[PDB]
Amino acid sequence: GAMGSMERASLIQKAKLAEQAERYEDMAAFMKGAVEKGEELSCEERNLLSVAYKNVVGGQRAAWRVLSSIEQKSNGPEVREYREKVETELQGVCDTVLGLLDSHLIKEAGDAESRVFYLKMKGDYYRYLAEVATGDDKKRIIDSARSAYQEAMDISKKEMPPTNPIRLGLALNFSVFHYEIANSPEEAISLAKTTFDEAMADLHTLSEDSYKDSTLIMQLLRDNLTLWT
Template identity: 60%
Template sequence: MESWKGQHHALAVVIFSSIVLCNRGNEHDSTKDGVGCGYSLLLSRVRLHNNTAKMSPSDSSREEYVYMAKLAEQAERYEEMVDFMEKVAKTVDVEELTVEERNLLSVAYKNVIGARRASWRIISSIEQKEESRGNTDHVAIIKDYRGKIESELSKICEGILSLLESHLVPSASSAESKVFYLKMKGDYHRYLAEFKTGTERKEAAESTLLAYKSAQDIALAELASTHPIRLGLALNFSVFYYEILNSPDRACALAKQAFDEAISELDTLGEESYKDSTLIMQLLRDNLTLWTSDLTDEAGDDIKEASKPESGEGQQ
């Protein structure tokens, strides 16, 4: 299981993923995303249009799938929500999803993957405790069970990554949607890197880095420094550097740059994105505070160790 520090970072990442959908949940490692917003309440007021006679069969199916996805979300049946939104994505073919549709897809997958990630951390923590106690029989049982969860995680990640590759990324036309989907691609490769080992972990990390960098190139050129999607990308990218690549210096540099650039343009923020953007900025600052503290502690430990000669070593 992750340390408290890892959970903190994970929470930050999860929060962003739901934030895009009107601050609706707590992301990262919980099954519910966000900070709370009236989005779910709006669903009760959503109704299908009655003029289906004017729509083509594909338009009718698309709208029905979207509505069913909203029903599934309210019923907290997220696997079915994923199924409905996958049908929407495949229905649109070369046309890109609307903002509402892509957010519904993101929320569906975030809840499905979030539950398994939380389970994996809990089981991994129990496994470590049993190993420390020398309970080999229990450890063997736990490893098998953890393997089952990892298979589910792999299947979920492969599902959304395949959809991104075949439909969502190719059909994205606006800079905002391109960054959104490339960031999403990086996120799910990162989730694979969290539990994969050896060559598979290396490949997942490389794919994460490639996706995040591609998204970053577009975001820096096309999106305002205060744009919630650009800020969310910086947040998740910095967590990737810190937790997967074990590079706190790069993590801090990326997070600090994103925060500083956004704070300098804060007065240009529109009312519609102010809450989302400032929340992500707070998460960036929280991570910076934590990571800087960790670096300071490590530096202090290095100094202490350097001041003591190692046993068996002579003075130079």
């Protein structure tokens, strides 16, 4: 890898600088290099990895949606060609992230906090693959996302309180999966509502700072329920 000659600590330091500079492709490359050093990642480091690739794939997804809309209205080869170019680049980013999770972040994650984080990410990047999928692998892509999300949910329910922000963000994203990928809007609504209500009943156990963390994500669940009902 092009980051193989850089110290792990220097890659983490530069990922943080890239974040401040809004240089998210650089941030992702640095965090990919850090992962490939082979050591487990800390909570802060997991967050840096997630933020970097969230921003990279987020720009690609937003571009793909613009182009797909234009392509739909048009229905020369240029619009299809350019949508395909963006799609292929997006798929490549998703494959890279899934490859980091499979080689070997997930198997070495021997804490619920780390394992749930990575399994949520696996569901997220299969979900992004599913958003653009159409051919003979779409159904398998969807099932791979569902399986990763479900294993993460099972662990999080056993090992984390209902206000834990990783658990809340997992349930939020699994609900979005149900609503717009799996065509299961009632599952999506049920999951968001149960997650919201169980977190509410646990808020009394929290410090002021944890309360702010949890209620921030609860608000996203609430806004989705308002949109969907």
